[model samples]
Every structure is written in C-alpha cells, then in structure tokens.
Target: IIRDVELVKVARTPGDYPPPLKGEVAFVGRSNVGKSSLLNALFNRSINFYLVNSKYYFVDLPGYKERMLWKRLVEDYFKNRWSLQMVFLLVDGRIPPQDSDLMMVEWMKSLNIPFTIVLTKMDKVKMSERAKKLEEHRKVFSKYGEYTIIPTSSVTGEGISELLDLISTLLK
Candidate 1:
C-alpha cells in the first residue's frame, strides 16, 4: 500500500495533542527503546517519521520518565485514545528481563489497548547471544503478555524493515 505522512502535532501529555481523531497507530514500549534511532533507521535514516501512510495519526508513547506522572499519563492515554491501533511494548534483549521491566510489560497486559513486544537494543549483545537474550524475554513475556517480539537495535540498524513491515501488518 502507498503511504503519505504529514508532520502532526506531538502530545506530551494527555489532551495536549489535537486530533483529527479518526486514524491513529502508535508505538508503545519501555525506556531507551530506540524509538528515535528506530525512526531514523526507518524513514530513510531521517528523524520524525514512518511512512506506512496510514490515515490514522501516528502517536509516540513509550518508556518512562517521572514514574508516577508517566504512569498516570500512560493509563490515561490508553483509556482515552481509542484510535490507537497497537502498542509495540519494548523490552531490553541483552539480558533476562529486569524485574522492573517484567512488571512494566505485565501492567500493560490488562490495558484495554492491543500491543506487541519490541526487544530493542539488540546490538547490545552478539549475534549468538541476541537470539538467546531475545528468547529469554520472549518466554517470560509470552506467559505474561505473549505479544509478538521483534528484535531491533539503534546501533546495528537491525529489525528496521521487520519492524516497519510489522507495523504495516498491524495497520492492515
């Protein structure tokens, strides 16, 4: 499918973003998940884009800062933003799940929104270790969340196309 993306307003907090409110596809995940580098790898190595050209507004919501306020904002976004298609919940794939990370993904499970698990920073480990580390998180997430897991790295540019394609599938 052909796609055209326009620069829309960014929402720092709930209600900060204006809306056509018709179509929206969002990326949702955890800290330092490489959303910036992922987008750079995605849109011709440029920033601020993914060109699937969906009618839905593309929203960026992931990771954390100010755990308390961010937590409330996350739930608020999920509860209110019915337009979002899916959340690519990110997890670090270099090691077995962090207790905090595991709890983070677990909390997203019950949110009314749909989601996928994105194993980011894959370049943190060697190729041999990549799969294993990814699998480690996968096993744990599968039981608690079971979202599709895709490995990516800002450093290596891995999983760029796979991630873009994954978004395409979800959009369709």
Candidate 2:
C-alpha cells in the first residue's frame, strides 16, 4: 500500500515553488471537473498526507478554467509553477468538449509541456456511449498521442490502477 500524502501551498508566482525536490504530478483542468475526487480516489486516503515520503509529490493546483476566478490570476498560476513533471488534465465525460478544454490542450501543446487527458465521471453514462465519447476526445488530442487518454470514475474506482501505472512509467 502507498505510504504518505501531503499538500504544500505555493504562492502564485515564479520561483515560489518549494525547492525542486522530487518530480511532481500536477492535476490541472477546468473547474468542477472532479479533480479533487480523482485525487482522493487515486491515493485512497484523506486530503493530507499523514506520513512523509520523499519519493514523489502530488500537487493539486487550483482549477484554471474556473469561471469564478479572474483571468489574470489563472494566467499567473499557469505561468508560475516549476518542477512540474506531468500534468493530468481532467475533462468531464458527461458533456461535449468545451472551449476551455480545447484551449488548455492547445496551450500545453504550444508550451511543449507533458500532459495526459483524463475523462472523469465515466460511470454516469451507458457503456454503449463511452466508446464514442472516448473517440471524440482521442481525435481532438491526437497530437499528444504519446500521452495517455483514460476514462475514469471515482464512484466506481475505474481506471485508477491504469492511471497509477501510467504515472509510474512517466516518472521513470
């Protein structure tokens, strides 16, 4: 079983990130995309890490595409962070792709940042509809084919192991 998990707050500015320690996996996406739920599911633990482990750090950055957040603040957060190994971009499976999702994907492409596409709330839809939904996203993210595109559901624990394995490979 996994050991410890923790949350470290970093100011929204360049050079404010905790000293470059081990690699980090950051969760970034539109607001209410079930990012927090996905993290809880992945660790199978509470919000904070009870024991300290130096091998890996998981950073849960605020949702950039939140409508309530000011554009400038989002921009600052995106541009400021350092030592980000992989970005897990979460998209809601129940709805058609949004402009914000497309924009974030494009931005990551432009910046040449490594990222993976994760579709949340997969269990909400029927199995017959899932293939089409996955395919649609696959088409949009074809450019980043080397990165993963996974269907996940916190309620059913779907895709959790596959995601952890993928992260393991990427980290190595």
TM-score of 2: 0.81
Supply the global lDDT for candidate 2: 0.71
lDDT of 2 by residue, 51-146 (tens): 225566676666755354545544554566556677888999887678888888887777666788899999997878888888777777775456
Which tens-of-lDDT digit does each residue in 61-111 have in candidate 1? 646646777777677777777767777666667767778766666666666
**Which candidate ranks first by lDDT, i.e. highest?**
2
lDDT of 1 at 137: 80
RMSD to native for every prediction? 3.6, 3.6
- Model 1 lDDT on a 0 to 1 scale: 0.65
User: Candidate 1, residue 42: CA error in Å?
Assistant: 2.1
Q: Which 10 residues in a row give candidate 2 its minimum summed lDDT?
A: 46-55
